[PDB]
Amino acid sequence: DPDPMKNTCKLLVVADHRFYRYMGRGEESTTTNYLIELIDRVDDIYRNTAWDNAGFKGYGIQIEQIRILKSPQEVKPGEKHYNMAKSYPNEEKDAWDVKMLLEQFSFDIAEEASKVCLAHLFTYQDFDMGTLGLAYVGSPRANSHGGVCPKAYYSPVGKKNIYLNSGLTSTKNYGKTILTKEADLVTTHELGHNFGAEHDPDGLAECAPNEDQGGKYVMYPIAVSGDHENNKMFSQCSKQSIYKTIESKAQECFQERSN
Numbered sequence: 108d109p110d111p112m113k114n115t116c117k118l119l120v121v122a123d124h125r126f127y128r129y130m131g132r133g134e135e136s137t138t139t140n141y142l143i144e145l146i147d148r149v150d151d152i153y154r155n156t157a158w159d160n161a162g163f164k165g166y167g168i169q170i171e172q173i174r175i176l177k178s179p180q181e182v183k184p185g186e187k188h189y190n191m192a193k194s195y196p197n198e199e200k201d202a203w204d205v206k207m208l209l210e211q212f213s214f215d216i217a218e219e220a221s222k223v224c225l226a227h228l229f230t231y232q233d234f235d236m237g238t239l240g241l242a243y244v245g246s247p248r249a250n251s252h253g254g255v256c257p258k259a260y261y262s263p264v265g266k267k268n269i270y271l272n273s274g275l276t277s278t279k280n281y282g283k284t285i286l287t288k289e290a291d292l293v294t295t296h297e298l299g300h301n302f303g304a305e306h307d308p309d310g311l312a313e314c315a316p317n318e319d320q321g322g323k324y325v326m327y328p329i330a331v332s333g334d335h336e337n338n339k340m341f342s343q344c345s346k347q348s349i350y351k352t353i354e355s356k357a358q359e360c361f362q363e364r365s366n
């Protein structure tokens with residue numbers, strides 16, 4: 108049975124200056140509200156999911172803390188930060204290499220990451236080949252690094268404890284803002300990774316249904332559009348992975364749903 112005291116993964120949500128400016132129109136209230144609403148809509152998907160196809164449901168996400176970054180992180184030569192104006196490594200391209208950004212983020216945000224189930228970055232940059240987000244995949248293993256629940260690993264190079272309870276979402280793609288319903292999907296998918304799911308096996312009928320059958324599920328390896336009914340749901344494949352991870356990890360860092 109679910110523990111009503113341990114059914115909610117509380118988030119740190121960060122908006123960088125690219126998100127603030129383009130998505131939030133350079134207004135704290137707009138940015139803040141957009142993200143509060145997005146997460147609440149992603150929460151409705153999670154909370155309503157029955158992970159064992161019976162009564163293991165009511166698991167969700169809520170914002171512990173939001174951080175809004177109004178202007179770029181001023182950076183010295185040879186220096187880098189996830190909120191810096193420059194795209195790393197190629198400063199000519201509009202966007203970072205996504206893996207490097209999540210790594211930079213996890214590194215820069217480490218102190219705050221330690222207090223939360225998950226940290227999520229929201230940005231506004233155009234990643235190569237239509238990439239929209241990235242996140243560490245969670246696991247039932249206590250020893251595991253990645254996904255739900257802060258687990259320190261010492262980094263000799265970074266001179267500190269790091270945490271891999273992190274993920275990112277971008278709302279820009281192919282030169283334009285993506286649909287609202289697409290943004291819900293990216294964050295659902297990336298948090299899906301955090302919660303223990305790998306990508307759906309692409310030839311498996313049950314976990315990758317044909318269009319007549321409702322279309323693909325949200326962990327499909329190629330971005331679903333949101334036009335089809337299955338697109339915002341989790342497959343049995345994802346359910347099984349996430350179920351195990353929640354079973355193990357809820358006790359560790361899940362909290363009570365707040366009003």
Ligand SMILES: CC1(C)SCCN(S(=O)(=O)c2ccc(OCC#CCN)cc2)[C@H]1C(=O)NO
Binds near residue numbers: 241296306328
């Ligand atoms: C690391 C990856 C390049 S591997 C290939 C899939 N993507 S992605 O194209 O950026 C992507 C795909 C689907 C997503 O969510 C559903 C949606 C939508 C809106 N159309 C989000 C990102 C990344 C990946 O696996 N990230 O976890």
Ligand SMILES: [Zn+2]
Binds near residue numbers: 296300306
């Ligand atoms: Zn993915």
